[PDB]
């Protein structure tokens, strides 16, 4: 009726998937470069 905007419809973000997307937008050549530079310390990550 009398239109407008009315109240209706928080937490904490993390860059997890954000860093992942940083990898994906980055090219797979250097993306694998990071992937190695990532999996190095992750001992269970081959």
């Amino acid at each position: 009726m009398k239109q407008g905007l009315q109240l209706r419809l928080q937490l904490a973000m993390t860059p997890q998937l954000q860093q992942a997307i940083r990898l994906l937008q980055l090219s797979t050549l250097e993306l694998q470069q990071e992937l190695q530079q990532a999996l190095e310390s992750n001992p269970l990550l081959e």
């Binding site: 009726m1 239109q3 209706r8």
Partner: protein, 256 residues
């Protein structure tokens, strides 16, 4: 077989059945001269199972118990990225039913603005979805029934008389409670079998000519929902299937 809900042995009911058989496949707009209680939501789903698309369903739900905003704002639904207050691409129930049949109800309740919009759809069929967009049409029958005399209501100048014709393919009357008299004994028997099954009452313990006369005198304000509901009240009065049925709770809402 649609279970033959309201199996009307009445020749009037029989002819109503024959004609409903004739035109339900005629998946076209038509005029049901009908009221709630008297076959309250009785034939629509049959004609939908009798609709051209047996695969095609019966959304309907176009009862006009809604007054002002919700009636339309669900009718067309509404737009996604625009509305009074919701980002819901409410496609409207018109989008909902594909293949089959749907009915509009309490049609007398509608305003003239709604009247012209709907009668237009009955003609236009394409529609911009409330918010406004490229209009689009559906191909299906049109169904509605009203308890009033829309010839007078249009004589009262209230509705799309254009609708009151374009829908009005043939004003299709159906039997009232007062209509059902000799088959009313059978209807009582059938509702009784149904109740004794449901109420876990063993069976028809028997009819009372006294209860029979009480019901016969019962002018029966409602037609069907009254039949079942008063059956429920009277059964609660009896609550057993031994003594012949005389405890007739004609007014489950009688005082004290």
């Amino acid at each position: 077989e649609y279970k033959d809900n309201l199996l009307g042995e009445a020749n009037s009911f029989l002819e109503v059945l024959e004609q409903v058989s004739h035109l339900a496949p005629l998946d076209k707009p038509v005029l049901i001269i009908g009221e709630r209680g008297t076959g309250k939501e009785l034939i629509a789903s049959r004609l939908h199972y009798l609709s051209s698309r047996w695969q095609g369903p019966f959304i309907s739900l176009n009862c006009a118990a809604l007054n002002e905003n919700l009636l339309d704002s669900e009718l067309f639904g509404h737009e996604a990225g625009a509305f009074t207050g919701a980002q819901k691409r409410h496609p409207g129930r018109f989008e909902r039913a594909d293949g089959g049949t749907l009915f509009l109800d309490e049609l007398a309740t509608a305003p003239m603005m709604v009247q012209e919009k709907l009668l237009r759809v009955i003609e236009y069929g394409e529609l911009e979805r409330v918010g406004g967009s490229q209009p689009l049409q559906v191909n299906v029958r049109l169904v509605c029934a009203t308890n009033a005399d829309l010839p007078a209501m249009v004589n009262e100048g209230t509705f799309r008389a254009d609708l009151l014709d374009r829908l009005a393919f043939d004003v299709v009357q159906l039997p009232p409670l007062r209509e059902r008299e000799s088959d009313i004994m059978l209807m009582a028997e059938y509702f009784a079998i149904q109740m004794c099954r449901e109420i876990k009452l063993p069976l028809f313990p028997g009819f009372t000519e006294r209860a029979r006369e009480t019901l016969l005198n019962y002018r029966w304000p409602g037609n069907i929902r009254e039949l079942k509901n008063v059956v429920e009240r009277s059964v609660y009065r009896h609550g057993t299937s031994d003594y012949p049925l005389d405890d007739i709770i004609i007014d489950p809402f009688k005082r004290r």
